[PDB]
Amino acid sequence: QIVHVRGDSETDLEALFNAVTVPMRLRKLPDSFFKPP
Amino acid sequence: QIVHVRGDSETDLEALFNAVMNPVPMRLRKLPDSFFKPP
Amino acid sequence: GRSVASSKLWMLEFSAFLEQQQDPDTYNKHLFVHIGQYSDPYLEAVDIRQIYDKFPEKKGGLKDLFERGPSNAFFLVKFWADLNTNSSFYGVSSQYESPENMIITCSTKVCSFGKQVVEKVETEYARYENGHYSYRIHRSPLCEYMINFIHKLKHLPEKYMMNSVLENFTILQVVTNRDTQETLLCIAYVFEVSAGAQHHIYRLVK
Amino acid sequence: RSVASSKLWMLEFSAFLEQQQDPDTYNKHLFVHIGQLEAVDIRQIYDKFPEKKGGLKDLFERGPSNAFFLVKFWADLNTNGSSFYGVSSQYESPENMIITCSTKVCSFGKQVVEKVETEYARYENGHYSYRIHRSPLCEYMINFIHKLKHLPEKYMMNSVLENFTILQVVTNRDTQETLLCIAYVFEVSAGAQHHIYRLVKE
Ligand SMILES: CCCCCCCCCCCCCC(=O)O
Ligand SMILES: CCCCCCCCCCCCCC(=O)O
Numbered sequence: 001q002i003v004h005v006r007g008d009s010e011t012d013l014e015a016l017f018n019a020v021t022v023p024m025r026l027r028k029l030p031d032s033f034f035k036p037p
Numbered sequence: 038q039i040v041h042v043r044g045d046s047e048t049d050l051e052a053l054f055n056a057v058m059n060p061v062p063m064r065l066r067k068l069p070d071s072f073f074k075p076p
Numbered sequence: 077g078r079s080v081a082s083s084k085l086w087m088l089e090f091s092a093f094l095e096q097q098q099d100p101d102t103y104n105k106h107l108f109v110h111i112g113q114y115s116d117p118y119l120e121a122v123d124i125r126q127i128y129d130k131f132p133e134k135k136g137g138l139k140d141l142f143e144r145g146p147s148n149a150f151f152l153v154k155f156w157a158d159l160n161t162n163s164s165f166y167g168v169s170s171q172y173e174s175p176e177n178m179i180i181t182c183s184t185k186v187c188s189f190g191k192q193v194v195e196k197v198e199t200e201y202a203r204y205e206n207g208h209y210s211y212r213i214h215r216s217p218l219c220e221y222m223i224n225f226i227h228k229l230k231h232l233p234e235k236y237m238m239n240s241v242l243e244n245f246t247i248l249q250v251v252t253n254r255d256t257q258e259t260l261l262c263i264a265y266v267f268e269v270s271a272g273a274q275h276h277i278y279r280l281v282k
Numbered sequence: 283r284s285v286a287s288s289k290l291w292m293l294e295f296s297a298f299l300e301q302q303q304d305p306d307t308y309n310k311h312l313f314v315h316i317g318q319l320e321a322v323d324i325r326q327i328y329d330k331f332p333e334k335k336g337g338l339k340d341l342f343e344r345g346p347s348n349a350f351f352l353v354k355f356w357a358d359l360n361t362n363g364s365s366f367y368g369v370s371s372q373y374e375s376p377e378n379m380i381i382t383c384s385t386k387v388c389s390f391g392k393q394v395v396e397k398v399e400t401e402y403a404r405y406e407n408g409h410y411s412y413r414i415h416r417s418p419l420c421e422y423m424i425n426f427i428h429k430l431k432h433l434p435e436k437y438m439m440n441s442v443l444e445n446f447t448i449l450q451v452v453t454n455r456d457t458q459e460t461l462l463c464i465a466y467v468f469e470v471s472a473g474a475q476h477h478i479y480r481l482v483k484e
Contacts, residue, residue, distance in 0.1 A: 001216055004195040009221050012193050017228060020240045021129070024266070030120045036156040036274045038417060041396040046422050049394050053445060054429055057438045063467070069320045075356045075475040100473045101315070101358045107306040158306045203404035203413075272305045 077113045079277050082149035085180075085251060085260035088113055089171040092218065097163040106161045108226070109273050111153070122152050124280040127264060130190050130246045138248065141262055142280065150280035151263045158273035159230055159238070166218035166226070172211040172251070172261075177202045179254040180211055186221060187246045194221045199254065229269070238269045284319060284478045287349035290381070290452060290461035293318055294372040297419065302364045313427070314355045314474050322352050324481040327465060330447045332386065332393050338449065341463055342481065350481035352465045358474035359431050359439070367419035367427070373412040373452070378403045380455040381412055387422060388447045395422045400455065430470070439470045
């Protein structure tokens with residue numbers, strides 16, 4: 001198993017959370033995409 | 038997986054237990070001392 | 077059960093899990109997500125242009141791969157992951173089948189805001205079984221980025237915050253024939269947290 | 283590299299009970315486990331295995347003698363939604379072969395159940411890997427484990443086990459060569475443990 005990790009994966013992981021474009025809920029996706037089975 | 042079962046497997050299984058439910062052994066054979074003591 | 081299947085490769089199983097060893101003879105396994113082998117639901121189509129901005133788009137990105145084809149090898153999986161969990165091993169297992177004997181490469185790209193942050197590359201060899209060829213990725217370790225991401229999501233006080241964070245998180249798995257570079261399967265993964273684990277599978281179309 | 287002939291090495295062997303609490307939660311208990319050698323005179327165990335044509339003595343005399351092993355297990359029976367009793371094993375060989383694994387469950391030296399599985403090779407680092415994954419335990423074995431656990435004392439379980447053996451024979455299907463022949467003997471653990479022995483002619 002070869003793993004390629006970007007040099008800033010640590011700060012990039014926190015950048016996903018720091019924030020909390022068209023939202024997925026408003027895109028042309030089937031109704032099933034937002035209702036779990 | 039191909040399984041060949043003997044026609045009397047149910048009563049055969051009960052026969053293993055009959056000897057203990059109604060009351061040369063390995064311990065007396067030429068086996069190493071380690072055979073009867075778990076690590 | 078042919079759902080995530082092109083004309084050359086079928087993914088029979090895919091699961092990601094946390095296994096805890098209580099003692100040498102006792103293990104507890106929790107599944108975060110699981111696709112495996114009742115009634116196959118019809119796979120609804122999704123216009124792939126609706127997801128291009130969520131995956132890498134440089135040379136060799138999702139659009140280039142899709143345009144190269146074959147179009148029947150592209151899928152979108154929406155998962156509702158089960159994060160209700162407590163000597164730990166985080167792993168991914170998957171199984172594939174093909175009528176052909178090939179050397180396959182499975183590349184998994186973990187993406188943040190549509191950009192690759194981690195790439196895992198695994199090479200797999202065929203095993204003949206019952207007239208076909210089987211390929212297995214058994215207990216492949218979850219990378220540290222994914223393990224720390226699962227931990228950080230679980231520390232959020234509400235599931236809607238986890239779903240908000242997950243809006244910018246995606247995974248792109250590309251399985252290719254190593255000797256021909258043919259795309260055997262390309263699966264885009266999108267996530268929400270389950271409010272057990274559930275999924276819907278879609279065919280990606282132009 | 284303990285259970286290994288010149289053509290096949292059994293890397294792993296485990297028998298287990300896996301319970302599904304719900305679709306995302308599984309608990310697995312190992313009854314026995316070999317994972318990653320004193321000699322025993324094979325004549326000391328002939329009466330505990332079938333001895334008709336193709337029996338243990340015939341197989342041993344045909345050879346090769348380096349393919350024969352005796353495993354003594356101390357099984358862990360300390361267990362318990364939907365249950366699955368299974369056996370998993372993994373083998374390695376420098377050769378690409380079709381192998382047949384026959385498992386004979388024996389009572390008083392007589393075969394009661396035989397399971398036959400055919401396995402093909404997967405190339406791995408210049409050598410070949412073979413895997414029997416989650417092979418189902420037969421009903422005879424499942425009911426035997428249940429009956430064993432219901433005995434009120436471990437010495438009674440050991441007494442019952444005196445007349446219970448398992449013989450596993452792994453063969454190259456094309457040449458009929460015996461790649462591994464493993465005789466299994468059991469006691470109940472007072473975790474699970476084992477000792478591996480080489481079977482020799484004297
Ligand atoms: C909702 C976030 C929980 C994560 C669910 C697991 C998703 C499948 C894992 C596939 C990632 C393999 C790549 C890797 O770990 O290196
Ligand atoms: C003490 C006896 C129970 C210990 C656990 C059983 C280990 C035997 C595994 C091999 C039996 C598989 C053959 C079969 O049932 O078809």
